[PDB]
Design a protein around this ligand. Structure first.
Ligand SMILES: CCOC(=O)[C@H](F)[C@@H](O)c1ccc(Br)cn1
Length: 130
C-alpha cells in the first residue's frame, strides 16, 4: 500500500540522519571509506565482506534496508571486521579496536533513544508479509 511505502521512506530518512552523524565524528574517519586495495592488498584476503559508512549510505538509497535490524547488521560488520583485522597488543591495533567499539556503541545508543519500538515492529511486520 502507499501507507507502507511512506513507512519505508520514513525509515530511510531516519537511517540517513544517523549515518551522517556517525560519519562526521573524527574518531570514525577510518570507517568512512572502503580500504584501498593498493595500500592494503592483504585486506580482501582476510576480510571476506568489507563494509564502510559510504557503502551504507549507498545501500540506504538502493532500498536494501527494510528494518533497523538489517541496518544494524551492517554497523556490526564494520566493527567485527576491524576487531578481526587488527587483533594485536600494539598501540595502532588497540586504538582502532577502541574506535570500532565506540562506533557500534554510539549507533545503538542513538537508535535506543530516537527510534520508537512500535515503528520498528511495523517495518518488521510489513517485511514478513512480503
Ligand atoms: C530532512 C532533509 O534532509 C536533509 O536535508 C539531509 F541533509 C539529507 O538530505 C541527508 C542527510 C544525510 C545524508 Br549522508 C544524506 N542526505
Amino acid at each position: 500500500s502507499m501507507q507502507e511505502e511512506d513507512t519505508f521512506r520514513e525509515l530511510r530518512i531516519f537511517l540517513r540522519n544517523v549515518t551522517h552523524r556517525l560519519a562526521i565524528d573524527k574518531r570514525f574517519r577510518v570507517f568512512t571509506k572502503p580500504v584501498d586495495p593498493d595500500e592494503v592488498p592483504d585486506y580482501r584476503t582476510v576480510i571476506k565482506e568489507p563494509m564502510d559508512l559510504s557503502s551504507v549510505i549507498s545501500k540506504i538509497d538502493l532500498h536494501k534496508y527494510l528494518t533497523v535490524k538489517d541496518y544494524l547488521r551492517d554497523i556490526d560488520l564494520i566493527c567485527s571486521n576491524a576487531l578481526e583485522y587488527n587483533p594485536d597488543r600494539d598501540p595502532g591495533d588497540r586504538l582502532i579496536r577502541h574506535r570500532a567499539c565506540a562506533l557500534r556503541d554510539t549507533a545503538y545508543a542513538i537508535i535506543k533513544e530516537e527510534l520508537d519500538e512500535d515503528f520498528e515492529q511495523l517495518c518488521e511486520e510489513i517485511q514478513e508479509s512480503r
